[PDB]
Amino acid sequence: IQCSQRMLSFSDALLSIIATVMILPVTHTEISPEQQFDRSVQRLLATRIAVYLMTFLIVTVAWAAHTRLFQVVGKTDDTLALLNLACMMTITFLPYTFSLMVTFPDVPLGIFLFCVCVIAIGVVQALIVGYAFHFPHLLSPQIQEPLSKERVEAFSDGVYAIVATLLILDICEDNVPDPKDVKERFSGSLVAALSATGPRFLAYFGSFATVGLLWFAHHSLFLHVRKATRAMGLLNTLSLAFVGGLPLAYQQTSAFARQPRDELERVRVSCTIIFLASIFQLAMWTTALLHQAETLQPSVWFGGREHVLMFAKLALYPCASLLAFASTCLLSRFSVGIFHLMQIAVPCAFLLLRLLVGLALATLRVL
């Protein structure tokens, strides 16, 4: 009989990979230069987005069920590890089957495959439960609503890492100049061929910075969380789902724009995605504040030392996104520059957040 922590961490990593499988088609969608094709291209992209959102949810539900199952099976053994591997393997087919079901609505085989995968997941989990109850010493002591904060943190960390490294993975695969290309299409200059790839690196820069800072806020919040809840888990799931869309937004804000309005609308979309990703972290914090006695450490309670700093940390990005979005409507001519200035400023504000909070508190105290 063994401790289950490493096995559950491995399962969380696998589930995080599977939950994000359908983002690659979205980011690998090519921004066509011909605007006349837009109507078609958009129709594809939106669909690819919708599927991504559904899959991430469905897998999340499975993950949640897993998190509950092994709250009832505390200690693991060899048989349970092998069975959990089987369960992970079954879960890995959910995205493909759902994608096939949506791609072939009128073919009854797609729904059959998806339902059979769901049934197989259920069967393996029931086998795990039966095995653990046949050997009672593998059950949790209380067996012989809250979600395990451990699993939430691990799953979120995996999702954040994948989303932060998506664009660098794509660059490392696709954008190493061909030695022959550097000759004819760049007159032998590796400098020029690399410079012709600047926009993609700027996109990776922006995406990694934003995802890392959102992870930083999430990490700061869950460092103070005594107990996670189902509502908090749902809000975290929504936040991660919208975090997945940040690399796309940053790709679109570095591409070439024939018309300024395209730049403006891409900025709008980017700010909207950032706001959606961050407002649900803030909602997580606010919902936890409803039951701070049970969910939060005293430090972040109302009147605590770290309450205001935590609120500022979790409300920074939403406020910045809202300000940029409002500028796009009221200060259009400067909106793109404001967006870039925000991309530079927000990391600096996170760096100097404590001093800024103290300064604001003192200023309001004297005022």
**Which residues would be at the binding site for K ion (CB under 5 A)?**
9, 13, 17, 154, 158, 162
Per DSSP, the three-state class of 110 is: helix
The answer to whether 199 contacts a second copy (rule: CB under 8 A) is no
Report how far residue 304's alpha carbon sits from residue 143's, in angstroms, rounded to the nearest whole number: 37
Task: Select the residue interacting with a second copy from 182, 269, 322, 356 (CB under 8 A).
Answer: 182
Q: Helix crossing, 353-366 with 332-351: angle to 10°?
A: 100
Smallest Cα–Cα separation from 118: which of 90, 82, 99? Answer: 90
Q: Which does 285 bind (CB under 5 to 8 A by kind): a second copy, K ion, none?
A: none
Q: Report yes or no: 199 and 255 within 8 Å, Cβ to Cβ.
A: yes
Q: Which does 129 bind (CB under 5 to 8 A by kind): K ion, a second copy, none?
A: none
Element (H, E) at 357: helix 353-366
Q: Which residues, including other chains, have CB under 8 Å from residue 146's CB and lie 6 or more apart?
A: 227, 228, 229, 230
Two structure tokens written together for 291: 């039951």
Give the nearest distance from C-beta 161 to a second copy in angstroms.
4
Q: Which residues, including other chains, have CB under 8 Å from residue 190's CB and lie 6 or more apart?
A: 177, 182
- The one-letter amino acid code at 239 reads S
139 or 168: whose CB is closer to a second copy? 168
Two structure tokens written together for 332: 């259009």
Counting residues that bind a second copy (by CB under 8 A) gives 69
Q: Which does 28 bind (CB under 5 to 8 A by kind): K ion, a second copy, none?
A: a second copy
The answer to whether 95 contacts a second copy (rule: CB under 8 A) is yes
Two structure tokens written together for 10: 């491995």
55 or 295: whose CB is closer to a second copy? 55
Two structure tokens written together for 89: 């393997």
Which part of the chain contacts a second copy (CB under 8 A), choosing from 57-65, 67-75, 155-163, 330-338?
155-163
For residues 267-296, which are near a second copy according to CB under 8 A? none
Contacting residues toward a second copy, per CB under 8 A: 2-3, 6-7, 9-10, 13-14, 17-18, 21-22, 24-25, 28, 78-79, 81-82, 85, 88-89, 92-93, 95-96, 99-100, 103-104, 107, 109-110, 153-154, 157-158, 160-162, 164-165, 168-169, 171-173, 176-177, 179, 182, 190-191, 194, 208-209, 212-213, 215-216, 219-220, 222-223, 347, 350-351, 353-354
